Amino acid sequence: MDVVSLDKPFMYFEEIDNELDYLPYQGQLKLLLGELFFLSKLQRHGILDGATVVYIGSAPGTHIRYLRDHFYNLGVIIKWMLIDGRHHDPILNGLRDVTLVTRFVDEEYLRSIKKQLHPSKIILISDVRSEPSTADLLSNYALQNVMISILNPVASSLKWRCPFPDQWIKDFYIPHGNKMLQPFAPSYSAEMRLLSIYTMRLTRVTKSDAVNYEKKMYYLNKIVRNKVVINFDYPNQEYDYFHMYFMLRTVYCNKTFPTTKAKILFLQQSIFRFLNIP
Ligand SMILES: Nc1ncnc2c1c(C#Cc1nc3ccccc3[nH]1)cn2[C@@H]1O[C@H](CSCC[C@H](N)C(=O)O)[C@@H](O)[C@H]1O
Numbered sequence: 001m002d003v004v005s006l007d008k009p010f011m012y013f014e015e016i017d018n019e020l021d022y023l024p025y026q027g028q029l030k031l032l033l034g035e036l037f038f039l040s041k042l043q044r045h046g047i048l049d050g051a052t053v054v055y056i057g058s059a060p061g062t063h064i065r066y067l068r069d070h071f072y073n074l075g076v077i078i079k080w081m082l083i084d085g086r087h088h089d090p091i092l093n094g095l096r097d098v099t100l101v102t103r104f105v106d107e108e109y110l111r112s113i114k115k116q117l118h119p120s121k122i123i124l125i126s127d128v129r130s131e132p133s134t135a136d137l138l139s140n141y142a143l144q145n146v147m148i149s150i151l152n153p154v155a156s157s158l159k160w161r162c163p164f165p166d167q168w169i170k171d172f173y174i175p176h177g178n179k180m181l182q183p184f185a186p187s188y189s190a191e192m193r194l195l196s197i198y199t200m201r202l203t204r205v206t207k208s209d210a211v212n213y214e215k216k217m218y219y220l221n222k223i224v225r226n227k228v229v230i231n232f233d234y235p236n237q238e239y240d241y242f243h244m245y246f247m248l249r250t251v252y253c254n255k256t257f258p259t260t261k262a263k264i265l266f267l268q269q270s271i272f273r274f275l276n277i278p
Pocket of ligand 1: 031057059060061063064083084085086105106127128129
């Protein structure tokens, strides 16, 4: 891995500044970090407390247990509602504050869960997916807009991977938000998480945006993520660990540590141990 000297990683897609012509249970780690990042940002904004997290497409959702235990141990009052047609990981069983729902959501069912949660704050996390086609994605993203227009969450994190330019169909619309980059994504994934705080204006996505995404993400996965951050004071200086480190320092802990590095190391250790990563 070519060596590089960096002050910070790319945290949002907008920050990628160049382009190029296109672990065990790593998937749970990718979800866990981005959702710890998203929910920790909401905690900083004082809006996570008293909210209800509605996670659609949450199964098996092994990592969600770590998320709940994290905020439960910080004293943050959160109710979870995990909805999926598939059965969740049994490690999510027996938690009074976690509600498991075995159902594929449609418009009608989004209306009813809104009814039963209103007027409580809703935080939406979506990871629904139906290799997928461009029509599958357009259906998925429409459904996610339908989640926002009906559930009207105070914040959302949405699965967001633009369709490839060579499989384009039609321009579509997605919510405004920051496009959060995911460490420990698959080697050449172009998926981000669309993070939005609502104070919902939609954005047109065009075929040129699909070209910009494909090239920016390829540069990120070929060049950026294969670097060693040699100034990085950490047991592992590979970029994805550099990237994970900067996400993890937005996380709160009841425990006190002598240094920030000691805090990130403890958190990473905790996360890997629960996910059974060496
Ligand atoms: N409507 C839904 N509601 C809820 N969950 C849904 C869906 C959905 C769909 C659909 C669909 N196709 C249609 C075709 C025609 C008409 C209407 C249609 N509607 C898929 N999923 C779940 O998304 C997960 C992705 S992996 C997450 C991984 C997870 N985040 C983890 O932590 O491991 C899977 O577990 C899957 O079961």
